[PDB]
UniProtKB/Swiss-Prot annotation, chain B:
Effect of residue 10 to V: In strain: Omicron/BA.2.75
Function: Attaches the virion to the cell membrane by interacting with host receptor, initiating the infection. The major receptor is host ACE2. When S2/S2' has been cleaved, binding to the receptor triggers direct fusion at the cell membrane. When S2/S2' has not been cleaved, binding to the receptor results in internalization of the virus by endocytosis using host TFRC and GRM2 and leading to fusion of the virion membrane with the host endosomal membrane. Alternatively, may use NRP1/NRP2 and integrin as entry receptors.
Glycan-linked positions: 34
Protein name: Spike protein S1
Organism: Severe acute respiratory syndrome coronavirus 2 (2019-nCoV)
Assembly information from the UniProt record: Binds to host ACE2. RBD also interacts with the N-linked glycan on 'Asn-90' of ACE2. Cleavage of S generates a polybasic C-terminal sequence on S1 that binds to host Neuropilin-1 (NRP1) and Neuropilin-2 (NRP2) receptors. Interacts with host integrin alpha-5/beta-1 (ITGA5:ITGB1) and with ACE2 in complex with integrin alpha-5/beta-1 (ITGA5:ITGB1). May interact via cytoplasmic c-terminus with M protein. May interact (via N-terminus) with host bilirubin and biliverdin, thereby preventing antibody binding to the SARS-CoV-2 spike NTD via an allosteric mechanism.
Taxonomy of the source species: Viruses, Riboviria, Orthornavirae, Pisuviricota, Pisoniviricetes
Length: 43, 47
């Protein structure tokens, strides 16, 4: 994924940060943003 | 052995403060001992 500067505040005892679906969102602080992906259609 | 801690200012006289206050972890000591009873320690006053 892509490491991004995070505006979220992490407590000193917190290492990882998970959003909905219990998937990794931020890691000690850098936000994880999966790089661009999608579908491809042919007309 | 896990200690979670929190501190708060209260303005009652003799009661248990109501409301909600989450306690953040303080320490996680890797000791691993058998504990079944405990006692508190308090300091007295002399003059
Ligand atoms: C911690 O120590 C206590 C002793 O006060 C243990 O309690 C006894 O355990 C034995 C088994 O080893 C039993 O036969 C006794 O009946 C228990 N007595 C009581 C009052 O509970 C306890 O098992 C120990 N715990 C660990 C994890 O070792």
């Amino acid at each position: 994924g892509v490491l991004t500067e995070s505006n979220k505040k992490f407590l000193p005892f917190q290492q990882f940060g998970r959003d909905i679906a219990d998937t990794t969102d931020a890691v000690r602080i850098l936000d994880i943003t999966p790089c661009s992906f999608g579908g491809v259609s042919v007309i | 052995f896990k200690i979670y801690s929190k501190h708060t200012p209260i303005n009652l006289v003799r009661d248990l403060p109501q409301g909600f206050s989450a306690l953040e972890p303080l320490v996680d000591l890797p000791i691993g001992i058998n504990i079944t009873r405990f006692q508190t320690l308090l300091a007295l006053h002399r003059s």
